[PDB]
Symmetry: D3
Subunit: 251 residues, 6 copies
Amino acid sequence: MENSFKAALKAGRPQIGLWLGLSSSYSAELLAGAGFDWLLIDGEHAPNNVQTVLTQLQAIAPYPSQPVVRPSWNDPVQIKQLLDVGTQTLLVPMVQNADEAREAVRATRYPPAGIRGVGSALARASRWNRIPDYLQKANDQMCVLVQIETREAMKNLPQILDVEGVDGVFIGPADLSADMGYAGNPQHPEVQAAIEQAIVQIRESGKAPGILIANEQLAKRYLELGALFVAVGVDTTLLARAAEALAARFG
Amino acid sequence: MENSFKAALKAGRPQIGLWLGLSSSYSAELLAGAGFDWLLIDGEHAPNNVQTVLTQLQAIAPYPSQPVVRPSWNDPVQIKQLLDVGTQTLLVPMVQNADEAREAVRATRYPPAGIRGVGSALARASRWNRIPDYLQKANDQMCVLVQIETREAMKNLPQILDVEGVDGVFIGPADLSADMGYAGNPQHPEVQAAIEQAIVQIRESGKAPGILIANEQLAKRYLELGALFVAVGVDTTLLARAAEALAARFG
Amino acid sequence: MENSFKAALKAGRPQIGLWLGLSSSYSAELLAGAGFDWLLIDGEHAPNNVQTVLTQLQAIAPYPSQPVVRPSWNDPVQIKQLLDVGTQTLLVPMVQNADEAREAVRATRYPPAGIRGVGSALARASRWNRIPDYLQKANDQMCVLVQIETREAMKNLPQILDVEGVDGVFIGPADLSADMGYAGNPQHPEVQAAIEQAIVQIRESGKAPGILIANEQLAKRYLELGALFVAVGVDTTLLARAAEALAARFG
Amino acid sequence: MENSFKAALKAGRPQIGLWLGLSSSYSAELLAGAGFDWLLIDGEHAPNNVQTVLTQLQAIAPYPSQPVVRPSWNDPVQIKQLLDVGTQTLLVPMVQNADEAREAVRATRYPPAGIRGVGSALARASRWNRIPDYLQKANDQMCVLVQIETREAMKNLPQILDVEGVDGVFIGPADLSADMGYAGNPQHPEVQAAIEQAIVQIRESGKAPGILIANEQLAKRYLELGALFVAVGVDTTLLARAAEALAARFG
Amino acid sequence: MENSFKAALKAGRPQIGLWLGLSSSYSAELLAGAGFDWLLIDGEHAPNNVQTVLTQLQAIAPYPSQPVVRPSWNDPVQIKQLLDVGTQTLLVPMVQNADEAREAVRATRYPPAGIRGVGSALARASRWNRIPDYLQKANDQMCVLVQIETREAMKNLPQILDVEGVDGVFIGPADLSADMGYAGNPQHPEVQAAIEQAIVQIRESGKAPGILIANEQLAKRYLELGALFVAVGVDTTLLARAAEALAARFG
Amino acid sequence: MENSFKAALKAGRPQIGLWLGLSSSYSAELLAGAGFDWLLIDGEHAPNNVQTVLTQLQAIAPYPSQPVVRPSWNDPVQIKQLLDVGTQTLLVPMVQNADEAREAVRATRYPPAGIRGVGSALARASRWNRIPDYLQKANDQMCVLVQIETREAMKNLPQILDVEGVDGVFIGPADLSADMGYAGNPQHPEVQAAIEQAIVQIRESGKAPGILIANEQLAKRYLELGALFVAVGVDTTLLARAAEALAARFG
Ligand SMILES: [Co+2]
Ligand SMILES: [Co+2]
Ligand SMILES: [Co+2]
Ligand SMILES: [Co+2]
Ligand SMILES: [Co+2]
Ligand SMILES: [Co+2]
């Protein structure tokens, strides 16, 4: 039950990822064999729920690619349910300040370190109580990544970075650009400056910066700067764009 | 991606609807061909979720009948997820005051006009980014309908009607009658008076009144008065009552 | 595990039925409360399989209406599977002769009386081996109804009626009329004559005649002639026609 | 629609239960025939949602075992949806004080006694309006059980017990032991003392104490003391432990 | 209910296609917007059944791309079921001779022209009896494409082309190459010769040649020779290879 | 893609197994961690299909227990489909003679050794063409186990054992006892004699004997005689009996 993605971030090994919005355990398996370090199961902007997350985790399990799950919001109840089906790495949307970051962290940790409700017998998390001493080992293998997506969140970043248990900070360029006045198009100097400055500040605090970016040159730039969990594409886009290009070649 | 139901309400063309509680993409298609102007996919009182809404939207898509979705509550997160699978017309339950109406409207609109989170690449809403300039066109095709179901909501109606982006106000007679002391039976003079007065006030403000009513004479009365989105039956009731009547004719 | 539908036919008590093509456990429960004696789960012309039959049987179980299941064909493998999930009354399509009727009966009976494969520990049919002496009691509670749908089958009817274990013979007017050249409209004197002559002959042999007929006058005419399992409507039709009628009443 | 579990608790008849985390309508039916007085469908720590609850209720319906449902939290919206698919007995997690207990009770009751939204036509709860006078009978057959799982909740127990409509109080030993410093292992004298004292206080107030405990001697002790709804095992554990023991006997 | 794919082949307009093996209604919709003339829902080599074909047909329906469905074999029972859920164009595997081609055609046609069973009230195919004179118009809109996959089938090609109702003949290079001893690599002169000779001969007879070929140079070569339904890629391949390429570009 | 179950049988290492009839990917994972050498996914007597087999194979994949799948019959079309979703070991029911055993073997092998249809780009079996030289390596990793279930099959056992590619012969005691007139109780000396004589004869030929037997004393007796794949319990039975025992201990 060692969290190898978390260990890698801690060791400063960059992790290359793919976003999964196809919401299917079948395509999840197909993509789990494609050579990515991590896969993001999106519960926020794709039609997933706890049950489809579970089946995608089962599909991915025997592959080297590590799963990360994004809940629909920073919700303790939804976090608890995701952890019980076996989620160990969470990407939490719209974290605006240190208090919200702390709530995310505590949602993942058993008392006294947190408020995670106990339900080990029922849960894939402990493999239905086959993992010995699960309750005592579980906290240290939880990896909490928080998303900063607004000017307010950027302003609060130093404080968010001071929250123990925050292992990484993810920047969402589309949401950030929208908040900043550029309508979801991050290719504006003011937006890139903010992103670059955040990546540096995060890495300087001893924590992992992350980002999703489909432009491969921008992705390489962010990696060169020091980002440690970079998603470089989205399943739905890869499929749609490859199919459209193919049809176009025949008229 | 033009919202034709919204255009019709704006133009004062009455829209006749059917309520869908069967929670099935198969019966949704069957009913999409029956000649209604709109169909209500009920996420509140029928066993639907974002995923079943998605499949019902897919089933209805090639038909002229327009889909409207009712979330379980006035919840920004649930609203965001519904919009991403392609929902453009929402019927929001238990809207009690202008602040709640405004939250519903802003949940549907991209910044700065609202707080809708961006996730276009992943979403059926933009047809996975095939709709050009989706981010810029999306706000104007969202149609927000709010439900008033209590005496408190009736008292606040003038203020609710002043909220920009509120395109229509739906009256739920059963909930209203319950709140007023008549136990969900709207056939009491005090309740009909309130309903009639609301329909008039709504239409006089330049907005669309709506209602669900299974009694066909009452429905015609409300249409005569000026209601613009009137649901005249419920799938489950049509099926149950037709089946029971049939069995009764044979003993 | 007494088959009450089977006992009713044997006692000459007419059974009024509804056809289920909505392929949903939810609408099946709704319809199970409507007052029919029997309900036909259609695995031939509706998108059902062994698994959806199972969920529909579970939904119907606490109600008085008795389930009957139609396999896609007279296939002993499919029959075995349907029996294991708890089917006790089968309506077998396209039975052309006495050998085929015999094959249907034998598919439902444990050796030596038939070729039904044994798997009671696994099966809802024995309630996972809770039903005492299941193996010894099962054969006698199976009820086999065979469909005659062609001129060939009509010619072989006397031999088919001589087959032990054939409890009922069902006439399918649409298929029969199509085979007879009146495709597929059964309102022609020569089709009605064939139908009515078969009903009389079936009942004369001491077996139960059955038919599906949405016209209530014809249904009563068939009952007068001795028909004992008469399906008088179809769920999809009831819903589609009620919905269309409603929408039309509002323009 | 009489709630027989509720009547039994009121009459002081102890009810022996099994916890269902397998989240399957198929295993639910299998277990519904095993002789338990009640079955707990766990929406909190197992991968269930309103839809899977519905199918499990349908599976259990014809059996004598009574269903109890645990929502993911004390959420009025989720409670409403569960009640509409037919839930009449709720086990509500993390109830910390009298105000929270009162919110749980009011979520289950139609106005004026509560805030339950009306949606009878659509709901299995009224059997799609076949239950006559459902709106007037529904409140009295709702049974609300609240979970106390923290030292804070224990402190507030006398006040929680004074809340009308609270029919029972369930103690979760694992969560309680975690809150008390013993890491989810309830076998510590301080924890057993607290549990024993709560069971007595609950029963002395005229209300039903409940608990889940897999140790059969502890369960018998709690029953001897006066507990009235005792779950004595969990489906997932029974299966896992029986399978592991079996494999071990062969090496 | 005009079959536009069928009309295009008859008019000599080449149709460019994509194979769908992802077995999902969600990715089917995504791909339906990509610009292909046709989409192949594979019931033979992908985990589809009648029910998933149905949901994929619903998803594709509002788009210009036309669905074609491949049953698992030339089985008249499976064909009947696929036709009832609305399939109008079938790609039938392993057709070895003219008798088997005739059997495929006849499975799709109502008597007297075939043996298709009647069940229009139940079926999406007639839109639940909304399509006027469905029974009279259906036969002419069925489009039957047969696969030749062995040396035996190649030998019988002239007789197969003489079968009325065979609208197209599809060559499966992998299966053919395997039968020819080059298992299963079709890049050998003798396989290419057999393929190209068949395409010429099929087109010469006035029927449509088809093929699946992921190599775009070969695809254009087959088009030059007169092939009229050419599938130029497979969804699972497009996704797997794009994902693998992306991951490799980042090390 | 080495078949380790197949290698174990060939090396004379007995494999202890559990039968899976719960038809759930969730309980399959739970049971995959219980310590059995193999797990039987039953497509004959449990409500599984190609799609639920797929999800169960995905769930079991990361565990040491090896899956074996039982098709509903010796059907080459069903076998092809199960092989494409990744099945490598098949337990084929009702194999009566050497021709039928040969047909089973040939259904699993690519030409020229068999008639297995080619579709690797689409199939989990090749991991969507990631497995290098899949077509060349697949045949040798297929493991075919045939069930002898009748006196006829027992008579033909010597010829069946002479069939190349038959790796194992499984005796089904319930079906065999039913065929022998002891329906379906296998505790009679003449049934036990037939069973034990077959086990000895199978092993003598250098092939693996198999059997399902819930009685642990009999299971050890069969192992002593040389049986090499012995299923020692059934999931549904384990769960039902443990639950019933528990409930009874509490009255
Ligand atoms: Co974002
Ligand atoms: Co309401
Ligand atoms: Co028929
Ligand atoms: Co608890
Ligand atoms: Co092929
Ligand atoms: Co057997």
